[PDB]
Amino acid sequence: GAPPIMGSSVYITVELAIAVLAILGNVLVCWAVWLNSNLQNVTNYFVVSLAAADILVGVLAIPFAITISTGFCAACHGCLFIACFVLVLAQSSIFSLLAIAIDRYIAIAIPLRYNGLVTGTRAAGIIAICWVLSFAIGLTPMLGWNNCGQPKEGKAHSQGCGEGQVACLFEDVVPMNYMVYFNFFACVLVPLLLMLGVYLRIFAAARRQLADLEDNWETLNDNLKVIEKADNAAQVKDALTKMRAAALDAQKKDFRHGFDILVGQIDDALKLANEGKVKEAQAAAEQLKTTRNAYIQKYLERARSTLQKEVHAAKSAAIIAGLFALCWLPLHIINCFTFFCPDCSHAPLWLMYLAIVLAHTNSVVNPFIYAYRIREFRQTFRKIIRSH
Ligand SMILES: Nc1nc(NCCCN2CCN(c3ccccc3)CC2)nc2nc(-c3ccco3)nn12
Ligand SMILES: CC(C)CCC[C@@H](C)[C@H]1CC[C@H]2[C@@H]3CC=C4C[C@@H](O)CC[C@]4(C)[C@H]3CC[C@]12C
Ligand SMILES: CC(C)CCC[C@@H](C)[C@H]1CC[C@H]2[C@@H]3CC=C4C[C@@H](O)CC[C@]4(C)[C@H]3CC[C@]12C
Ligand SMILES: CC(C)CCC[C@@H](C)[C@H]1CC[C@H]2[C@@H]3CC=C4C[C@@H](O)CC[C@]4(C)[C@H]3CC[C@]12C
Ligand SMILES: CC(C)CCC[C@@H](C)[C@H]1CC[C@H]2[C@@H]3CC=C4C[C@@H](O)CC[C@]4(C)[C@H]3CC[C@]12C
Ligand SMILES: CCCCCCCC/C=C/CCCCCCCC(=O)OC[C@@H](O)CO
Ligand SMILES: CCCCCCCC/C=C\CCCCCCCC(=O)O
Ligand SMILES: CCCCCCCC/C=C\CCCCCCCC(=O)O
Ligand code: NA
């Protein structure tokens, strides 16, 4: 039985190193959004709320974690607060991650009404509501779902605790059924599975919209060939009607002028076709190639470029949500083994604190993901660092 202070010193030192990195990195995130108006959108307001939660992990949750690892004597309800405040920050992170995913689905599924529906004022109201709900969820043990009514009196007496005090240990005061059923299953696992469903819908919507862009482009060029090798006016008419319906379908200033020319030129050739002038209709339809090269192809390439940037931005946000799951799941899974298998030996002490440190490391990783995957953040980070 090596002296407890030795293994404790390693744990505390690692925790302090994580606290400094979580504060520095996420302060840089908040500083960047404050300074750059190009980073000031609804999506990044939830990013800032997520960074504030990670800042508080280093300022409060990690000092709280170091304190409870000592098992110090404390009034049980004060011990409860130290033990549960990290659950508030974790729940806030979940709400921010879910809001980011929903925000990106709205942008890709209904971009015409995104700016009218998703505003900064409504976003700030959602952020406040989610923080209130995070305190209620994370501090639910302080409402009565705790073990303070059944204190470990032998442990308190051996540590010399005073009357009404307990040895402040996490699994002594926080019920494991709350941690597994309420916190993990209901409040962590279900929202993460919802985020998964949202991102699946995002990428499915992106793939469908890109295919529709390419299908209208192919339909335009195929029907042009049909008109060129038609032998009667009725065949030219058939191809032109399909081109006109697709042109209006692809339309839903230089963008508008290009489609205004295209639809008008289609109506010109259609009128010649209805008069039975095949050669004259085919020559009029040949003018469409000038409009296609000068206007339509540029919109196709820009619409494609915008969708691919939305896919890339959604992938970056999904990586953030996935890294949250990877960092928090081991600790939750260990609680499941403790709760569901009382015949299994408890996970060893070194593995408990490895899982605790790993969960805390999640508060360090998000600034690196933004810096490596988002150019606007990376450039703003460099300006802040260089100029300071
Ligand atoms: N489960 C849990 N524990 C702690 N801290 C106490 C660890 C040391 N114990 C010391 C006494 N035991 C022990 C006894 C013999 C051998 C090994 C261990 C249990 C662990 N902190 C937490 N945080 C979240 C958590 C937060 C969010 C999701 O899960 N679970 N958790
Ligand atoms: C704005 C920020 C900096 C304020 C932070 C306040 C924190 C540090 C305070 C608020 C409530 C406090 C707890 C209230 C009750 C108890 C029970 C006592 O038997 C031991 C200390 C303990 C567990 C306190 C520890 C410190 C504590 C968590
Ligand atoms: C900005 C918002 C979250 C305000 C923060 C205030 C919180 C952190 C403070 C304010 C008053 C504090 C409480 C005051 C008294 C007690 C009684 C003690 O037996 C257990 C701790 C407990 C329950 C404290 C826990 C922390 C506490 C709830
Ligand atoms: C989230 C991804 C990376 C999966 C992580 C799997 C981890 C959390 C799993 C894999 C194997 C598991 C261990 C396998 C066996 C035992 C022995 C039992 O007496 C207590 C739990 C304990 C010690 C498990 C704890 C959790 C564990 C370490
Ligand atoms: C997000 C995805 C990975 C789903 C989460 C999977 C979790 C809920 C699964 C993975 C492995 C599972 C554990 C595997 C083995 C045992 C031992 C058994 O005696 C009691 C249940 C218990 C402890 C399981 C509980 C649930 C469990 C922890
Ligand atoms: C123990 C005490 C600890 C205190 C806990 C504090 C928890 C609450 C913290 C919340 C941080 C929220 C910051 C999030 C800020 C988001 C940006 C915003 O909302 O403004 C943009 C829009 O307004 C545009 O119109
Ligand atoms: C930027 C503000 C950050 C706050 C710095 C606080 C750092 C100190 C970390 C942990 C303090 C833990 C004290 C341990 C409890 C006493 C031990 C015992 O009573 O047995
Ligand atoms: C963990 C317990 C959860 C508590 C369940 C019910 C509490 C929250 C209820 C409603 C939140 C909705 C807030 C709506 C505010 C109105 C905004 C407006 O005026 O436009
Ligand atoms: Na977090």
Curated annotation (Swiss-Prot):
<dbReference type="GO" id="GO:0001975">
    <property type="term" value="P:response to amphetamine"/>
</dbReference>
<keyword id="KW-1133">Transmembrane helix</keyword>
<feature type="binding site">
    <location>
        <position position="335"/>
    </location>
    <ligand>
        <name>adenosine</name>
    </ligand>
</feature>
<dbReference type="GO" id="GO:0005886">
    <property type="term" value="C:plasma membrane"/>
</dbReference>
<dbReference type="GO" id="GO:0008285">
    <property type="term" value="P:negative regulation of cell population proliferation"/>
</dbReference>
<dbReference type="GO" id="GO:0035810">
    <property type="term" value="P:positive regulation of urine volume"/>
</dbReference>
<dbReference type="GO" id="GO:0048786">
    <property type="term" value="C:presynaptic active zone"/>
</dbReference>
<dbReference type="GO" id="GO:0014061">
    <property type="term" value="P:regulation of norepinephrine secretion"/>
</dbReference>
<dbReference type="GO" id="GO:0046636">
    <property type="term" value="P:negative regulation of alpha-beta T cell activation"/>
</dbReference>
<dbReference type="GO" id="GO:0042802">
    <property type="term" value="F:identical protein binding"/>
</dbReference>
<feature type="topological domain" description="Extracellular">
    <location>
        <begin position="341"/>
        <end position="348"/>
    </location>
</feature>
<dbReference type="GO" id="GO:0045938">
    <property type="term" value="P:positive regulation of circadian sleep/wake cycle, sleep"/>
</dbReference>
<dbReference type="GO" id="GO:0042311">
    <property type="term" value="P:vasodilation"/>
</dbReference>
<keyword id="KW-0325">Glycoprotein</keyword>
<dbReference type="GO" id="GO:0051924">
    <property type="term" value="P:regulation of calcium ion transport"/>
</dbReference>
<dbReference type="GO" id="GO:0006915">
    <property type="term" value="P:apoptotic process"/>
</dbReference>
<dbReference type="GO" id="GO:0032279">
    <property type="term" value="C:asymmetric synapse"/>
</dbReference>
<feature type="topological domain" description="Extracellular">
    <location>
        <begin position="146"/>
        <end position="175"/>
    </location>
</feature>
<feature type="binding site">
    <location>
        <position position="360"/>
    </location>
    <ligand>
        <name>adenosine</name>
    </ligand>
</feature>
<dbReference type="GO" id="GO:0031802">
    <property type="term" value="F:type 5 metabotropic glutamate receptor binding"/>
</dbReference>
<feature type="transmembrane region" description="Helical; Name=3">
    <location>
        <begin position="80"/>
        <end position="102"/>
    </location>
</feature>
<comment type="subunit">
    <text>Interacts (via cytoplasmic C-terminal domain) with USP4; the interaction is direct. May interact with DRD4. Interacts with NECAB2. Interacts (via cytoplasmic C-terminal domain) with GAS2L2; interaction enhances receptor-mediated adenylyl cyclase activity.</text>
</comment>
<dbReference type="GO" id="GO:0014057">
    <property type="term" value="P:positive regulation of acetylcholine secretion, neurotransmission"/>
</dbReference>
<dbReference type="GO" id="GO:2001235">
    <property type="term" value="P:positive regulation of apoptotic signaling pathway"/>
</dbReference>
<dbReference type="GO" id="GO:0007189">
    <property type="term" value="P:adenylate cyclase-activating G protein-coupled receptor signaling pathway"/>
</dbReference>
<dbReference type="GO" id="GO:0007188">
    <property type="term" value="P:adenylate cyclase-modulating G protein-coupled receptor signaling pathway"/>
</dbReference>
<feature type="topological domain" description="Cytoplasmic">
    <location>
        <begin position="35"/>
        <end position="44"/>
    </location>
</feature>
<feature type="transmembrane region" description="Helical; Name=4">
    <location>
        <begin position="123"/>
        <end position="145"/>
    </location>
</feature>
<feature type="binding site">
    <location>
        <position position="359"/>
    </location>
    <ligand>
        <name>adenosine</name>
    </ligand>
</feature>
<keyword id="KW-0812">Transmembrane</keyword>
<dbReference type="GO" id="GO:0048143">
    <property type="term" value="P:astrocyte activation"/>
</dbReference>
<dbReference type="GO" id="GO:0044877">
    <property type="term" value="F:protein-containing complex binding"/>
</dbReference>
<feature type="glycosylation site" description="N-linked (GlcNAc...) asparagine">
    <location>
        <position position="156"/>
    </location>
</feature>
<feature type="transmembrane region" description="Helical; Name=1">
    <location>
        <begin position="10"/>
        <end position="34"/>
    </location>
</feature>
<dbReference type="GO" id="GO:0005516">
    <property type="term" value="F:calmodulin binding"/>
</dbReference>
<feature type="transmembrane region" description="Helical; Name=2">
    <location>
        <begin position="45"/>
        <end position="68"/>
    </location>
</feature>
<dbReference type="GO" id="GO:0019899">
    <property type="term" value="F:enzyme binding"/>
</dbReference>
<dbReference type="GO" id="GO:0008289">
    <property type="term" value="F:lipid binding"/>
</dbReference>
<dbReference type="GO" id="GO:0050714">
    <property type="term" value="P:positive regulation of protein secretion"/>
</dbReference>
<dbReference type="GO" id="GO:0014074">
    <property type="term" value="P:response to purine-containing compound"/>
</dbReference>
<dbReference type="GO" id="GO:0097190">
    <property type="term" value="P:apoptotic signaling pathway"/>
</dbReference>
<feature type="topological domain" description="Cytoplasmic">
    <location>
        <begin position="103"/>
        <end position="122"/>
    </location>
</feature>
